[PDB]
Design a binder for this molecule. Sequence first.
Ligand SMILES: O=c1[nH]c(CN2CC[C@H](O)C2)nc2c1oc1ccc(Br)cc12
Length: 328
Amino acid sequence: SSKARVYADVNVLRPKEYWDYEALTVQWGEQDDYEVVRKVGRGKYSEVFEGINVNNNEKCIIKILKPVKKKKIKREIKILQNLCGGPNIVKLLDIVRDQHSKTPSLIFEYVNNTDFKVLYPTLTDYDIRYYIYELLKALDYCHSQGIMHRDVKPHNVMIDHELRKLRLIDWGLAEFYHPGKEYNVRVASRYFKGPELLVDLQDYDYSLDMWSLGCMFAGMIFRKEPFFYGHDNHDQLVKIAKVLGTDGLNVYLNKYRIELDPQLEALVGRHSRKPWLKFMNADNQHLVSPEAIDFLDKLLRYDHQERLTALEAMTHPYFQQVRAAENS
Ligand SMILES: O=c1[nH]c(CN2CC[C@H](O)C2)nc2c1oc1ccc(Br)cc12
């Protein structure tokens, strides 16, 4: 069946301890060491606060989890511990719990984030090259360490724009990649779901995060967020098919021997491919170079095996000034 084209044996070669997250025994820290200062975020699975570490008076972020199954939380914890220290991965600093209720908190490094809806309009052409390159560092790293993030989107990319610092967060949906394993397709967030999730191809791989990144990147260069704006999962595939065209979708489905639900097939219809330049207009013109569009094109492919890997993406000429700058 389908397999990743890179990093496919990472968890085969590492000790079982690295990936066997249910075997983790969590070493709980002192709940009292971290005080909540104010709320900064939330989602279906947590409430997030800026905090202080009372030992050293340093800022931190406190993610207070909503009731969660042991298996699920050990997965997030072990993935964070495995990736701690890697480029642009949020650092997990401690893990603590309330004694009475046993409510767990993950403690992270602090970032002064500006939400994307307010930050991304202010980014220059070069700023988008720079921040996407920094995000790619994180994704090549996690994929190289045998992990798929499975929820890449702007809400999970913290940026302190004054310091030009980026951290990829919220590993709640991340998993370890094992060849031929069939994963749950109910991952990512709708506007960023790959076609493989939307047609029920379960033997997907790191390439799923490259689709999500392409969706984010198309929203930034075209100033059209979200770029594929579906209402439900079926409509999400329709929004894609109206852009990339149904010919390529049919080639993909035939390659992997997938049949669409008859309902879905009828909704998707038949559509011509819409060239990327048709998305160009006066709000976005300052961002839409031929290098940007080439790079985007090589991420947004139906066939997950055709997409650029994160390592290839980093070497695309679109980023050549960011690389030159970073050589020093
Ligand atoms: O692991 C997290 N999760 C969330 C909450 N989620 C759900 C909303 C968004 O998708 C993200 N925030 C943070 C998480 O880690 C953080 C580290 C620093 C900062 Br600043 C914020 C966070």
